[PDB]
RNA sequence: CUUUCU
RNA sequence: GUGGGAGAGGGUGGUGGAAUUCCCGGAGUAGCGGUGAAAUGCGCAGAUACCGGGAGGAACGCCGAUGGCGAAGGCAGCCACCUGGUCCACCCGUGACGCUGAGGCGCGAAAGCGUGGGGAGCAAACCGGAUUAGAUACCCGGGUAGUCCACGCCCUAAACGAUGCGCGCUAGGUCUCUGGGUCUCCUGGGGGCCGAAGCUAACGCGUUAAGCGCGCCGCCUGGGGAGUACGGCCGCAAGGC
């Protein structure tokens, strides 16, 4: 799983300011984490479809959040992507 | 011709014919009777009456090896089981104990059609 | 009826999670390694649900029976 | 790491030596895999509900360790290897759910 | 056991 | 976000006992089996019934429900690992980031197909017994594909609640599963039954709407011809749309 450590380490790592638990960045950060762990799990267990849906949804939630970010602050966007390491 | 005195009495009941097998204190059968063993050939073989005559003959044949005390073990439900047990209870032998030991599966083999339509 | 007495009643506070208290678990099986129904175990959905799991872990270890022979009939 | 409870049932016919020898390979393996022994209970012999390997009795061991979860399954392949070890069962520790209290 | 048609 | 919770939700590996079949050994005879009756069938190369040992496959009694989980198909022995969803409390953070969704992509019971493996029980076809006016059936004795695993394909269904999704609004009562609480009840999530208002052709529905409304999608337009013909797309094929 993802230890509380692994988690908060990320929350702080992206937060906009001390206390920022749910900014668009923090969220997109945390998702990318879960997504990658899961994307990983499925590299194996290609037959675990039931879990795949979950992924299919986590992605949506993410790309949807980013869409919003791009629209609002395009700067923070380019900023975030490049960082997190999304797209490609 | 061994003189066992005490041992087991296995009763195998079924809706198709009873069949009693008397054994020694650790399993090896001394004698055995059934609906067939005695007259009865087809349908009657099952009947509780048959079960009686089989239980008796089973014991009589057992009285030969000098049987006296027996532990009854019933298996399966069927046309006269309690009958077979009463017969033994009379006969000569002393029925020390009786036990239902019918085998049930913890769900293993698909039963033939005739036994499905359940669940 | 089946109101002999709830198994839970005739007993003190025990750890339902303990897969080794053969002493007490012994109490939730009938005259066969069968796990008693709730109207006998006097337990409750959640409890009765964890009871079952405990009892099985035991059976495996070899502490509780999977099935006894009925003595009567 | 997670806290587990290992269960072991060996041949109840081992003499002082053989018996303590098994505890050797066991104690060994536990560590060889990362099992940090948090304590033990050794009830020894007990009357089994049914026979385990013709044997109608058993010698029970019980250790509660703390080890890297990613190796629990292997640690038990190992424990099962021994011929006198006829029962192995590793359980995730859990808070004692009481009742009748 | 089965047991058509009118 | 922090802290908790229940769970047959999914994937991999491991393992437990009951039963069936087969094989070996003991003990033991004349039958067993099966039906409405029977017969085929199996048995003196010794069966059935009984005990001990072994090999193997498949499913997982009780708990078990009127229960739970999942988007649906579906999911129940036990253990560990990997992993999805969902609910509650605190109200801490972002600040409309929302809803629906033609096409797309994915999932999709069973049967079926391709390659390889497996094969205990069951069993289309088939080979027999019986019943019958006849029996290509029902009942009985056998039995191949298949049912099982792997990888790939098929994409259908009474795929059902015969009821698309989301949000707001409109008496209560009772039972139930899971969470919180000031815990003989209140509060949130879920499953049932009876019912206000109202709705409906009626049956019934009734805060789990089939009521009152708004948004977006799919669909219908008498029956037969016919889910057929044609054309197109998909499939190895069967066949699908
Ligand atoms: Mg989860
Ligand atoms: Mg706030
Ligand atoms: Mg603000
Ligand atoms: Mg399919
Ligand atoms: Mg199939
Ligand atoms: Mg095939
Ligand atoms: Mg057959
Ligand atoms: Mg047949
Ligand atoms: Mg409710
Ligand atoms: Mg009214
Ligand atoms: Mg109603
Ligand atoms: Mg073609």
Query: Where do the domains of chain B lie?
Result: 1-119
SS (H, E, C) chain B: CCCCCEEEEEEECCCCCCEEEEECCCCCEEEEEECCCCCCCCCCCCCHHHHHHHHHHHHHHHHHCCCCEEEEEEECCCCCCHHHHHHHHHCCCEEEEEEECCCCCCCCCCCCHHHCCCC
Backbone angles phi, psi at B41, to 5 degrees: -110, -35
- Resolution (angstroms) stands at 3.4
| Backbone phi and psi for residue C72, each to the nearest 5 degrees, phi listed first | 180, -115
Residue A30: domain span: 1-88
Residue D78 CB: number of other CB atoms within 10 A? 19
Q: A68 by DSSP, 3-state: which?
A: helix
Q: Which of A9, A79, A2, A5 is nearest to A36 (CA)?
A: A2
- For residue D24, the surrounding DSSP H or E stretch is helix D16-33
How far apart (Å, rounded) are the C-alpha atoms in residues D47 and D55? 10
Q: How far apart are the first and last CA of chain C?
A: 21
Tell me the residues of D at the C interface, defined by beta carbons under 8 Å apart: 7, 9, 46, 48-50, 52, 58, 60, 87, 89, 91, 94-101
Asked whether the beta carbons of residue C70 and residue B85 sit closer than 8 angstroms, the reply is no
Contacts of D78 (CB under 8 A, 6+ apart): D29, D32, D33
CATH fold label, C1-73: 30s Ribosomal Protein S18 (4.10.640)
Distance (Å, rounded) from C-alpha B11 to C-alpha D83?
Answer: 40
Domain boundaries, chain D: 1-101
Query: Which two three-digit tokens encode residue D76?
Result: 């038990």
Distance of CA A42 to the CA centre of its chain: 17
Chain C contacts of D98, Cβ < 8 Å? 13-16
Domain definitions of chain C by residue range: 1-73
Spatial strand order in the sheet of B6-12: B29-34, B19-23, B6-12, B69-75, B94-100
- Phi, psi (degrees; rounded to nearest 5) at B10: -100, 125
**How many residue pairs bridge chain B and chain C with CB atoms within 8 Å of each other?**
20
**C-alpha closest to that of C7 among C33, C46, C36:** C36
CATH code of the domain containing A41 = 1.10.287.10
Residue with tokens 């900014």, as numbered in its chain:
A23
Query: In angstroms, rounded to a whole number, what is the distance separating the alpha carbons of residues A55 and A45?
Result: 13
What is the number of domains present in chain A?
1
The answer as to CATH 3.30.420.80 being correct for domain B1-119 is yes
CB atoms within 10 A of CB B117: 7
Which technique? X-ray
- Tell which residue, C44, C17, C7, C52, has the closest CA to residue D97: C17
**Distance in angstroms (rounded) separating the CA atoms of residues B61 and B33:** 9
In the DSSP assignment, the letter for residue D13 is: T
Contact B3, B66 (CB under 8 A): yes
Task: Tell me the C-alpha distance between A50 and A20, whole Å.
Answer: 33
Q: What residues in D contact C8, CB-CB < 8 Å?
A: 99-100
As assigned by CATH, the class of the D1-101 domain is alpha beta
């Amino acid at each position: 799983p993802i230890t509380k450590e692994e988690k908060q380490k990320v929350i702080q790592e992206f937060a906009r300011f001390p206390g920022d638990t749910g900014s668009t960045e923090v969220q997109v950060a945390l998702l990318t984490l879960r997504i990658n762990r899961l994307s990983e799990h499925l590299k194996v267990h290609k037959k675990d479809h039931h879990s795949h849906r979950g992924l299919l949804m986590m992605v949506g939630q993410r790309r949807r959040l980013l869409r919003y970010l791009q629209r609002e602050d395009p700067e923070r966007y380019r900023a975030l992507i490049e960082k997190l390491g999304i797209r490609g | 011709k061994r003189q066992v005195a005490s041992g087991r009495a296995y009763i195998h009941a079924s809706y198709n014919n009873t069949i009693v097998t008397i054994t020694d204190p650790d399993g090896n059968p001394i004698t055995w009777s059934s609906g067939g063993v005695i007259g009865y050939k087809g349908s009657r073989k099952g009947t509780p009456y048959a079960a009686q005559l089989a239980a008796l003959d089973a014991a009589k044949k057992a009285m030969a090896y000098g049987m006296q005390s027996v532990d009854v073990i019933v298996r399966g439900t069927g046309a006269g089981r309690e009958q077979a047990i009463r017969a033994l209870q009379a006969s000569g032998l002393q029925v020390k104990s009786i036990v239902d030991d019918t085998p049930v599966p913890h769900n293993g083999c698909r039963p033939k059609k005739k036994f499905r339509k359940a669940s | 009826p089946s109101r002999k007495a709830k198994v839970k009643a005739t007993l003190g506070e025990f750890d339902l999670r303990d897969y080794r208290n053969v002493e007490v678990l012994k109490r939730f099986l009938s005259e066969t390694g069968k796990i008693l129904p709730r109207r006998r175990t006097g337990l409750s959905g959640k409890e009765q649900r964890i009871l079952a799991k405990t009892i099985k872990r035991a059976r495996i270890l070899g502490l509780l029976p999977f099935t006894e022979k009925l003595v009567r009939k | 790491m997670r806290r587990y409870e290992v269960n072991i049932v060996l041949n109840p016919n081992l003499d002082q030596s053989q018996l303590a020898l098994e505890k050797e390979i066991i104690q060994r393996a536990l560590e060889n895999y990362g099992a940090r022994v948090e304590k033990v209970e050794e009830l020894g012999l007990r009357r089994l509900a049914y026979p385990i390997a013709k044997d109608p009795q058993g010698y029970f061991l019980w250790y509660q360790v703390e080890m890297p979860e990613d190796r629990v399954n292997d640690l038990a392949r190992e424990l099962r290897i021994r011929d006198n070890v006829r029962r192995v069962m590793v359980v995730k520790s859990q808070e004692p759910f009481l009742a009748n209290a």
